[PDB]
Design a protein around this ligand. Structure first.
Ligand SMILES: CC(NC(=O)OCc1ccccc1)C(=O)N[C@H](C(=O)N[C@@H](Cc1ccccc1)[C@@H](O)[C@H](O)[C@H](Cc1ccccc1)NC(=O)[C@@H](NC(=O)C(C)NC(=O)OCc1ccccc1)C(C)C)C(C)C
Ligand SMILES: C[C@H]1CCCC[C@@H]1O
Ligand SMILES: [K+]
Ligand SMILES: [K+]
Lengths: 99, 99
């Protein structure tokens, strides 16, 4: 797809058979999902944003489909207001910024 | 140009006669720069993100050059750790996500 920026770049993702809406976010190093249940063990991670820092759970090698493209990688889960797809997964799906 | 996402999409901008480095950010509704004085009047605004909300100063009709592409729009000024070029200006330079 080509996504313009007039509105937020929100796309459908699927993870654990569940469809969710998420933000394609070039200003995020990592992908951070709203609270939800994932499999396996997690490890702690702190991420910083505009208002300060939050603690999130890091899951590795997680299956996620983003607008139909499969990616397998790190997903953080925690108190984010919006599902955010970060550069770690945008790279796997071949996403670039162009002007 | 085409900007890959293996690293943060940092570019040179010019604003108020100053060169700065800023992040091309598809997940930002608004453009938010570190503390600076800009021409004209301002009004307070709260913006939210990972970690909560910060108070910023809003300036309107601000000229900016992003990678040598001119744009004009609202620019917010406050305690951000990174200069962020939001969708309000990414639209004007013809910026799109492609995969
Ligand atoms: C690891 C990392 N940053 C990093 O380098 O860490 C080092 C650091 C951190 C803090 C201080 C000093 C140094 C990073 O990738 N951070 C992401 C991030 O917050 N990125 C922000 C930019 C940034 C980059 C580095 C450091 C700090 C900030 C965004 O631009 C990012 O694109 C967010 C994503 C987002 C969208 C929507 C909701 C919440 C988060 N946008 C924003 O925060 C923008 N806010 C918005 O566009 C508005 C208006 N949002 C909004 O709707 O807020 C709703 C809300 C609801 C409830 C609570 C709070 C907010 C902002 C840049 C203007 C994160 C989501 C993984
Ligand atoms: C007018 C202002 C924005 C465009 C480039 C020069 C200057 O800093
Ligand atoms: K384009
Ligand atoms: K691409």
């Amino acid at each position: 797809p080509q996504i313009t920026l007039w509105k937020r770049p929100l796309v459908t993702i699927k993870i654990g058979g569940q469809l969710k809406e998420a933000l394609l976010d070039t200003g995020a190093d990592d992908t951070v999902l709203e609270e939800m249940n994932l499999p396996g063990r997690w490890k702690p991670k702190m991420i910083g944003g505009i208002g300060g820092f939050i603690k999130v759970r890091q899951y590795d090698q997680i299956l996620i489909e983003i607008c139909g493209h499969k990616a397998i990688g790190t997903v953080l889960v925690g108190p984010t207001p919006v599902n955010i797809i970060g550069r770690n997964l945008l790279t796997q799906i071949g996403c670039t910024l162009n002007f």
